Design an enzyme around this catalytic site. Structure first.
Site, PDB file in Angstrom:
ATOM      1  N   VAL E  48     -28.046 -18.413 125.522  1.00  0.00           N
ATOM      2  CA  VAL E  48     -28.535 -17.055 125.781  1.00  0.00           C
ATOM      3  C   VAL E  48     -28.673 -16.832 127.289  1.00  0.00           C
ATOM      4  CG1 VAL E  48     -30.467 -15.423 125.544  1.00  0.00           C
ATOM      5  CG2 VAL E  48     -29.773 -16.795 123.571  1.00  0.00           C
ATOM      6  N   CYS E  49     -29.074 -17.893 127.987  1.00  0.00           N
ATOM      7  CA  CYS E  49     -29.417 -17.843 129.403  1.00  0.00           C
ATOM      8  C   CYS E  49     -28.350 -17.170 130.267  1.00  0.00           C
ATOM      9  CB  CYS E  49     -29.697 -19.253 129.919  1.00  0.00           C
ATOM     10  SG  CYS E  49     -30.992 -20.135 129.006  1.00  0.00           S
ATOM     11  N   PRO E  50     -27.075 -17.549 130.074  1.00  0.00           N
ATOM     12  CA  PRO E  50     -25.981 -16.914 130.821  1.00  0.00           C
ATOM     13  C   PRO E  50     -25.898 -15.407 130.567  1.00  0.00           C
ATOM     14  CG  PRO E  50     -25.211 -18.912 129.746  1.00  0.00           C
ATOM     15  CD  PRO E  50     -26.596 -18.659 129.228  1.00  0.00           C
ATOM     16  N   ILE E  53     -28.534 -13.372 132.217  1.00  0.00           N
ATOM     17  CA  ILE E  53     -28.373 -13.357 133.659  1.00  0.00           C
ATOM     18  C   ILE E  53     -27.187 -12.489 134.014  1.00  0.00           C
ATOM     19  CG2 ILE E  53     -28.040 -14.730 135.719  1.00  0.00           C
ATOM     20  CD1 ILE E  53     -29.179 -17.115 134.277  1.00  0.00           C
TER      21      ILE E  53
END
Lengths: 165, 191, 166, 166, 166, 185, 165, 191, 166, 185
Positions: E48-50, E53
């Site tokens: 999810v992090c990508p 961002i």
């Protein structure tokens, strides 16, 4: 233990046998130079002589790179001197060019984290201190196994190289 | 710091990258063998990974003497895998035979006394652990200076020797060198 | 802190001694049934001649004839003790000696007997007369420069055994 | 707890002593400049003859000729001390005596010197050699049944003065 | 514990960030005079992090045009951040990005914002909206599996600037 | 301290709520087996219109159609809750409402959720999402001036339920039908 | 101090000189009888003799009312005996019919609240203990002033009277 | 308890009934004179007040030797006044020359160590305080037994004597009796 | 501190009371099954105190006819209470009275009810209404100069019994 | 602990009150120079009629004619106080009122006066009489069911003012004009 890499090496002072005489010796006496400071268990024993002799016999390889060497155990200065005056034949040191520091009170061994509470002497501990008095390296061996003059040399050279470049 | 020479090495467990996969790894998995357990500061820095590769390339020399090698840093297992999947050309590790243990929580580092509170990663620390899981040797280097495979080999051989024959190893001792009988009398046969 | 208290059991000790050229384990309790003269001296291999250790070793039979053993102790290792014994009296060595030399490397024995010098890392000159029930009967502490008297130790031991009896 | 430590200043003391039949205030510091033999004995008026106090008093000049004074002490009051002195040696009394008898009624002096028996309420037989700078040089503690030797005390004092000098 | 309290100054932070491919030192006080959306994500090279961002990065002008900046942060080192940026979005990398990636290797910042997971050694998904005076106005904490929304975040920033003004 | 920690059991609460105009005892544990949207608002009877309570009330069936209930809470007494509900929206009142209004008169619940403002004696605007197993999944804390969004709340509940079921994680902005990621390399 | 009126008198035990011999003596030895228990400063002093003698010489006036008398000071039993064997001429006690208890350790004096820390002996303290071992009366005098046998007698009689009626 | 022989008597102050009136009274008001300070348990009990009356009737004997007397109990000053205003016939005190100090708070009693926690009043305690305010004598009686004026007189006289001539007072000593010179030698002139 | 808390069991008490000219032991539990008006007043032989006690005494049937008793209490001894009762109202006494006068000489009861004045050594004017189950229902504390009212007290007792029932 | 001790300064308080339908900051110190009757009641908007607040309000001039003011207080917010006052007495509301309604939202005042019920989150019925110098003179604590009396309160204020002025103490039941006692033997 007060000994922490990249922090000033714990200050020590005490009586050493230097060229057969008793002299007061301080860590600060070595500012300006790198110092290989190492502990060995006990005088009149077995592995301790060989590694002290190896260092002494190859002392110029350190002095030629602005590096000095000091050895230490919990034995008294009188026992250090008797050991030096014992010929290598009989397992003595014979004459030696390295100072032998006495840690009779154990304060130095404890500050350096090498004291063995259960045995009353140190393990095989070696410390490389740079010319500003910062600790750079720590080598602790269990009692059966000696240290290497070549590995020590390599490390001093590497720190001096990375210091510069 | 719980690491004390001649006491059992501080227990540890975590996720390691082994042959491209995530595996749970424990210190106790190595009972029966010698273990070279070392920490390095960070994945993906601008300095070529000369030491991890040197141990990887010469791993057979350790396995031929009942010894395994494990490397560790505070990076995640995901970063470890990414680093391995990066070509040596570009600072990556490329494939590697040595497990890469992740210490995200810093617990393992702190237990081995190698963690740098000011930096958030370890210094260069190496630990030699025998087959009964007892800690025998601690080498701590300031960040700039790498470790030697040969010296590590020499130390492992010396401990296995003195384990076996009791006779103690003099300075510089490599396999085939004179050893000492640990007796005030028996010592003369050497000196 | 010191555990040596007169008319209490002498503080237990154990360690390695040099007995007749060999390393032997030695304990306070090995002397139960006998009087024990237990004394500390500062250091092996110093430039002051070993007058007192030798004086006791030379007169050891005067002690064994009154059911009394003698043990000497310093903070030196047993290896140093042996080396000292193996050094000729000519050169400050001890020479052969009939008294066990006990090593107190950890300093624990010296502390328990209250004879340890924190500042110097060895002991002062302390002598202790322990009875055959392991009870401490006498404590003599001398500042470093001054030695002990075999005759006085004999007199004290005989005296304690006399008042034990009558 | 005991404050007597060799090569440290002897624990300060002060109190009332009997000197030549009279009550006098006496302090450790009154002996600065001289060696002092300071010794404790259990009790006045017991059935064991005062061999040691008398032996010291009789040989007091051997001490004064080497710049050394002697002081005796017990937990008895100065009034008891006087009564004892005024009792003929014939009847266990002390008779006239040339050594000050110091009273340690509060037990504070005995505790500071580590010679007090909590269980018995008096001291054991403790003797202390203090030098002319007020530094403690020697400690001799005897279990109750066994007395002290004037000759040994002399030898120790002479010895300390010799090594002071050379 | 967490120092992050609504209507109080946001907990000061500083550290190394990758900004346009370079290592720069970055402080919270560098944002005074502007709104700041400061958010944490778990780990580089994750899932999810990508996406979160990327979304904030790709729509950054919608923040900058209302005097609002955006900074992202994980416990990853700045070297890992830079390697991730130099990883093509194809292979799950960030690709080039316009938002600073702050490194919190020591965990100090995460702990101050109360988003660190002691058990896992990284943060959860925490987002903080800080006004131009440095006052924390909003806290959003999501469990790991669920991403944040640029639209909701924008809506909140706008709501605060509007109530600030009127 | 606050006891509300994401991925830990939501802090237990109980108290009196107004439900369809009646006083009822209500427990957090009453909601096991369903998702719960539990949210705090400052005070009954102020001069700012009850936009957010009404918005949730008006859209309750969208929550109910996904196995999700909603509870609102303030430090007001249940008697004040009832009076407010019985005041016509015309006059700032709430008018009838389908969402329970839980009373936190003692302030314990507010303190346990870390939404209590010690200096004011009421809560800020806090919203919590609790799953069917009683585990706290989401915390939203707003300073007083700014309200909450039903759409955003719906999206979060849908996302947590999706990830609960499929594991696959939800990207930024994910709504029902959007692309998700298998949490695998 | 452990000494409290209407509470059991603090237990004591120790060596006394009784009719010229050393005997162990306990407070509990006196159950069944009233006891006048009193402390005096020091043997071989001044007021202490007279009040001990007054009590001893008038002992029958107590024994005839089921009352016993015990005297105590911090002096040793050996000093007590020497004092008894000192003729009243020379300020001694001469033979005495009252036990002299020794409180060498000071434990008894402290338990009774009569010890003088600064002096090392007691003040002039007198305690009346009834036949069940309960403390009934406490008289503490500063050192210069003796106690009265008549006042003591009056008090014992009063307690015995109010005990009965 | 702060009362210690040969230390200053614990300070006190309160309301006392003196000649039918309420007066503030302090321990320091008696500096310069000896003070006999005594406590009795309770006003208005069924036992005739023999001791307070005995001191009241013989008060001139104390004043002739620079000595005052003060009585005290835990009763209020109001109860004290009521008791005085009650005829001796009916258990009252009737008029009285000795001040009656009130210790309602129990502070004074506790400071003199005479308070009975279990009963809420004092035992029978008497204290002799010299002219420099030093405590010289403590007499504590169990409730049933009263105190003697004569004995109190004797003690006051003895302290004033030894204050003056130093010579110490033997047992039973009354004025005119042989005293002792406090010296191991001077004592013989007596023995 | 005060143990007296509304809606909790009234703090237990016991002591000596003068009841119809006699000393009786009295406990709070003697009143279970009845309402109890329990009030403190400062001191016997004072001013408001008599008038309040007289009023409750003279109107006691108005309490007893609603199953309510009344007890008064001061720190005065029972002997003072009895002497006060035997004092004619003329001379400010109570005269004979039908209400028990509890004595709190130790101050324990006053302290438990939180009415004791450490500064003065007596109570203020505190009144407590305790129900038939022993539960404290009412507390009234007045500064010294102002008396309580029988009518108000009656009104309160009646109000509680009425709400108990309906 | 409670800080309310008779004959000591009454515990300081401040907060927002509704006064003649407006929000005003109110401080205990605002009442220096006058007697103050300060009293707590449980909750606004319950189903028991506001008999006692109204009774005090209706009779306020009897207090004002003796230099005495009255303040009522509950843990309700000032917004709830205002809503209650704007609710017709017909419907349990207060209707207009002449007495300030002080809000103790944070519970601090209630705790300082020892009237707070930790288990309920509101106060019992406590009434306090504070003189012109800020000294607490009287404490009346009633369990919840039973109300207070204006007449009794009036009598106490009158008594304290009488004794303040004349010293002479007031007997049981004393009202204006009754016999008093000179505190002298």
């Amino acid at each position: 233990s007060k000994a922490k890499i990249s922090k000033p090496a714990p200050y020590w002072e005490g009586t050493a046998v230097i060229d057969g005489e008793f002299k007061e010796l301080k860590l600060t006496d070595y500012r300006g130079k790198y110092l290989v400071f190492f502990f060995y268990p006990l005088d009149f024993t077995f592995v301790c002589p060989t590694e002290i002799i190896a260092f002494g016999d190859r002392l110029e390889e350190f002095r030629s790179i602005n590096t000095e060497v000091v050895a230490c155990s919990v034995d008294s200065q009188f026992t250090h001197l008797a050991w030096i005056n014992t010929p290598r034949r009989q397992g003595g040191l014979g004459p030696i060019r390295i100072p032998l520091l006495s840690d009779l009170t154990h304060q130095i061994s404890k500050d350096y984290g090498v004291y063995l509470e259960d045995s009353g002497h140190t393990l095989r501990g070696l410390f490389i201190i740079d010319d500003k008095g910062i600790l750079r390296q720590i080598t602790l061996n269990d009692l059966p196994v000696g240290r290497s003059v070549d590995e020590t040399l390599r490390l001093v050279q590497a720190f001096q190289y990375t210091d510069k470049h």
